[PDB]
Amino acid sequence: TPPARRLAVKTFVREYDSMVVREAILREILRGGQVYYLYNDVENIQKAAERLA
DNA sequence: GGGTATTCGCCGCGTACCTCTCCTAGCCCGCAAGTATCCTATTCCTTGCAGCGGT
Question: Residue A38, CB, less than 7 Å from strand B?
């Protein structure tokens, strides 16, 4: 049930694309919110974060 | 042509009864059963450099 203003989290299952990631992150940033970017690999998480930067 | 000889291939080789063993190889496909990497707890310790009493 509610909490009242919960909104139907939209699900998109896309093949990986740099443009899609950039567009989503910029859309969230321009909104003022925050993005979770789940990588789930501590070995290469530093490289992944550096590349996303 | 043809009468003859020579070869080649097919057909055939008893009855009755008793004991025993053994009747495809291999592939495939799905079950299912047993394994290498990722986070939050745990027990395992061994160094590096500055304070610091003390004289």
Answer: no
Residue pair A28/A35 in contact (Cβ under 8 Å)? The answer is yes
- The token pair that represents A37 in the structure block: 């970017």
Dist CA A29 CA A37 (whole Å): 13
State the DSSP code for A8.
-
- Experimental method used, please? cryo-EM
Asked if strand B comes closer than 7 Å to A49 Cβ, the answer is no
Give the CA-to-C1' distance from A42 to B40 in angstroms.
14
The rounded distance, in Å, linking the Cα atoms of A31 and A16 is 23
Angle (nearest 5°) at CA A46 between A28 and A25: 10
